[PDB]
Amino acid sequence: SVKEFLAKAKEDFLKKWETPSQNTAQLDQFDRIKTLGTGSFGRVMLVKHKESGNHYAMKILDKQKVVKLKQIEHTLNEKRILQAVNFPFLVKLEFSFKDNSNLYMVMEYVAGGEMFSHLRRIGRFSEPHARFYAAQIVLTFEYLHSLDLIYRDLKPENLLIDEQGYIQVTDFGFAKRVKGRTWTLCGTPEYLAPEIILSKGYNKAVDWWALGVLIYEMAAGYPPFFADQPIQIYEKIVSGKVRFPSHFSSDLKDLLRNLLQVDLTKRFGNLKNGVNDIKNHKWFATTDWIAIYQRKVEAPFIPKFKGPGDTSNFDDYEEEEIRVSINEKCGKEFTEF
């Protein structure tokens, strides 16, 4: 049963959670090839591990920039959580270390690009395409929530597509292990549950709302609430009125009406039956959850590939020399990293 598999997953996580890996590599073991993306406080680069020839994605986080965004705890959470978890649909952290200037997280390289890019290009996904991705998120959250983790940043920009067309969830910058309620206003505006915007204190149910945004964006080709400025977006979410495209099936509208629910006594994922309220919904009737976990379902889309360290499924970014300062920066802030 899920219950029993989750049980043993918990025991696995807690061991690593309590006794975290630290300092398992160094910058000079890696050759740096290309930038694959950029964020608030750093970049992700394709790199090659010199002594194995294995390719990795290396996230470089500028410590000074981290400190000035007040993201120190958030960054310690990310690395602490990522070394401890293990599930098919989550990026794998192989190595981590730090120097005078930066933090580094070396993860398995995912060659197929971000969902975002394939979704913007083709426009929208078919409901079966969208459902194949949704299922994988449904399982990943059931995993994470079972370890008392909240993810807090679901969106196509964060879903990497592997060689087999399956998802890897990347960027745990806002993931947090919390049993009670939490308060940080963080995430991405289009994806914020109304209780976050309203500073009420909130819980894992914000992830189930974010799933509603994603299913909707995947199937409509745009999100349920958009405007040019964030403030405009928050007003639409707090009204909460959703219109569905004429092409949405009945089942999809109904699954969404229950995910994009302001009332928490009513939101799917959050009720007495928990995740089975979602998994047993009619929209998922065709889904075989076990074959999904096992990766035996045929992917509706296989990204195009051309070789080992190929980067054409990612955009091009301006390169920037990695400078490492001769003085140590923010030592005590990042001691445990």
């Binding site: 993201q71 975002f116 920009e157 910058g173 505006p189 964030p230």
Partner: peptide
Amino acid sequence: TTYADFIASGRTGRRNAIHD
């Protein structure tokens, strides 16, 4: 159309995380 309204908006590129 809603599509056309989206495509014409400034929020079709990769969307930054916020904090506060």
